[PDB]
Amino acid sequence: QDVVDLDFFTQEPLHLVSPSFLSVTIDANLATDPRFLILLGSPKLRTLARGLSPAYLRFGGTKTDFLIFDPKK
Amino acid sequence: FKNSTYSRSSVDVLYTFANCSGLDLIFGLNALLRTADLQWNSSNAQLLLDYCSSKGYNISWELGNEPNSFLKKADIFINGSQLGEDFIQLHKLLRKSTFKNAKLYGPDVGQPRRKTAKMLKSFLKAGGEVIDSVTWHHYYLNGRTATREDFLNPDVLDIFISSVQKVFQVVESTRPGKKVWLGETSSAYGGGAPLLSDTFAAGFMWLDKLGLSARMGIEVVMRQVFFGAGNYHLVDENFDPLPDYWLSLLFKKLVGTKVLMASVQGSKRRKLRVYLHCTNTDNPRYKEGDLTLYAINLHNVTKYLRLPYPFSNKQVDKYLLRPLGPHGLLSKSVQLNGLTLKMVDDQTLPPLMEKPLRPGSSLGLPAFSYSFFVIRNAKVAACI
Numbered sequence: 001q002d003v004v005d006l007d008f009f010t011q012e013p014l015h016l017v018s019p020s021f022l023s024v025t026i027d028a029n030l031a032t033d034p035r036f037l038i039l040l041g042s043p044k045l046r047t048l049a050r051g052l053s054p055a056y057l058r059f060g061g062t063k064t065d066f067l068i069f070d071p072k073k
Numbered sequence: 074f075k076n077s078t079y080s081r082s083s084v085d086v087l088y089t090f091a092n093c094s095g096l097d098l099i100f101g102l103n104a105l106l107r108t109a110d111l112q113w114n115s116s117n118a119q120l121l122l123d124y125c126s127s128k129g130y131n132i133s134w135e136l137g138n139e140p141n142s143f144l145k146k147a148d149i150f151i152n153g154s155q156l157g158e159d160f161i162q163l164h165k166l167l168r169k170s171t172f173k174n175a176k177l178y179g180p181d182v183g184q185p186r187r188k189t190a191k192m193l194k195s196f197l198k199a200g201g202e203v204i205d206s207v208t209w210h211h212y213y214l215n216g217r218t219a220t221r222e223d224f225l226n227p228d229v230l231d232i233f234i235s236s237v238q239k240v241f242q243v244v245e246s247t248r249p250g251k252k253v254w255l256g257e258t259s260s261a262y263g264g265g266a267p268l269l270s271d272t273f274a275a276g277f278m279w280l281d282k283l284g285l286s287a288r289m290g291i292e293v294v295m296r297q298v299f300f301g302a303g304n305y306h307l308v309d310e311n312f313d314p315l316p317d318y319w320l321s322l323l324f325k326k327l328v329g330t331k332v333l334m335a336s337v338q339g340s341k342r343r344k345l346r347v348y349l350h351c352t353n354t355d356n357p358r359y360k361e362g363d364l365t366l367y368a369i370n371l372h373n374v375t376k377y378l379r380l381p382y383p384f385s386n387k388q389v390d391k392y393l394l395r396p397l398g399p400h401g402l403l404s405k406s407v408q409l410n411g412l413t414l415k416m417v418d419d420q421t422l423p424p425l426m427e428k429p430l431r432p433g434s435s436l437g438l439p440a441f442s443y444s445f446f447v448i449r450n451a452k453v454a455a456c457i
């Protein structure tokens with residue numbers, strides 16, 4: 001038979017995670033993409049992002065250490 | 074990897090995107106800008122902080138990505154000692170910046186290898202004092218070689234536990250009490266596993282990672298990626314949400330910040346995986362004291378879960394995720410309680426509709442599925 005008993009600890013909180021526990025990255029790679037502007041422009045994408053709020057968004061990846069800021073551009 | 078640049082433009086699109094989407098931007102600075110002595114050259118970073126300040130941008134920071142392979146990546150080696158000093162320089166800059174009171178996370182090291190341990194210990198000895206959290210990276214699998222069996226293997230899920238333990242060993246030895254974050258995680262490195270990282274099958278790994286992270290004291294888990302080229306993307310190349318997106322939305326609605334514990338009686342407890350938090354109380358259906366159970370069934374048969382005393386006669390709302398056929402676990406579509414989850418339109422997310430179970434029923438969980446169960450009127454004082 002396929003019946004399973006659960007034990008629960010309920011006396012006290014074992015941890016507090018952040019309200020932003022479930023967070024997300026945008027790879028730094030994505031800023032070498034020509035469509036970058038179109039892509040983060042997407043109101044559809046923004047809708048989907050808002051649904052994961054609150055969350056941290058990490059802009060980072062291997063290209064983090066191969067990207068140089070240009071104020072002239 | 075070669076040097077590319079990016080404009081004041083790039084920064085702005087990124088900011089408004091996070092700003093507009095109710096998200097907190099963390100930006101990773103290039104740590105391979107070295108001086109002759111192989112100190113970090115901070116001049117370029119100065120320009121970016123200056124610009125960001127000039128625009129009144131609320132932004133947190135990082136410095137470097139997976140410093141452990143700088144030697145393989147850029148034929149430059151940088152030890153944790155130096156990298157810790159580098160984090161102190163940047164911290165000073167942020168204190169002198171207009172965002173004096175911005176957060177600084179690092180060092181985004183890969184997962185516990187012996188060498189990775191050493192880099193992180195020595196980095197934490199060095200720079201431990203200026204970072205608001207310790208960021209490290211996890212992947213279960215190589216995207217090139219990952220199989221469908223791997224994604225379903227409790228032996229693969231269980232390796233992540235040891236990973237976390239090794240990380241907490243280094244931190245407790247150097248900066249005990251410091252918050253630990255996963256700074257970049259997914260199923261599989263190398264961009265993910267085609268037809269796996271983007272399917273219902275991805276959700277076993279993803280939900281178990283969340284369960285274990287929360288249980289073992291990880292405070293924040295950063296999913297590689299929200300969208301992008303990689304198969305592990307939550308949203309695909311057509312701006313459609315994949316099953317991991319729906320899974321992430323549902324978790325967000327149901328699961329509170331206060332972490333509890335569930336476990337299954339019996340020597341075997343590897344294929345039936347169970348987690349317990351206080352219910353997300355924001356949800357106007359749910360009150361102070363309610364519990365959210367979430368459970369993964371990797372058995373090839375349905376399992377029936379009995380709630381322990383005194384919860385065996387509570388009203389339970391089921392939230393069961395199963396794939397839309399015909400591709401089963403290899404499907405990019407998912408049903409909640411047998412309703413297919415789709416955007417209503419570009420602007421509008423669907424309701425996520427519960428299925429009340431009859432009070433006193435066991436909790437049915439089919440083969441190769443995952444579900445949330447909100448235990449209503451649990452009246453748990455820890456969750457009050």
Ligand SMILES: *[C@@H]1[C@H](O)[C@@H](O)[C@H](OCCNC(C)=O)[C@@H](C(=O)O)[C@H]1O
Binds near residue numbers: 028029062297302
């Ligand atoms: C962590 C790295 O920081 C990631 O940049 C890398 O992803 C590369 C491709 N990502 C896209 C196109 O979204 C990742 C990986 O190997 O998958 C990790 O190594």
Ligand SMILES: *[C@@H]1O[C@H](CO)[C@@H](O)[C@H](O)[C@H]1NC(C)=O
Binds near residue numbers: 107108109114116
């Ligand atoms: C760091 O960068 C500046 C600007 O390019 C450069 O001129 C300088 O020589 C570098 N500093 C060191 C100490 O190597």
Ligand SMILES: *[C@@H]1O[C@H](CO)[C@@H](O)[C@H](O)[C@H]1NC(C)=O
Binds near residue numbers: 152155
């Ligand atoms: C670490 O690097 C610094 C330079 O940043 C060097 O002087 C120091 O002695 C190194 N120590 C080890 C053991 O690598």
Ligand SMILES: *[C@@H]1O[C@H](CO)[C@@H](O)[C@H](O)[C@H]1NC(C)=O
Binds near residue numbers: 373374
């Ligand atoms: C489940 O797995 C076992 C492996 O021992 C297999 O032999 C069995 O027939 C499977 N049962 C199903 C598909 O119901």
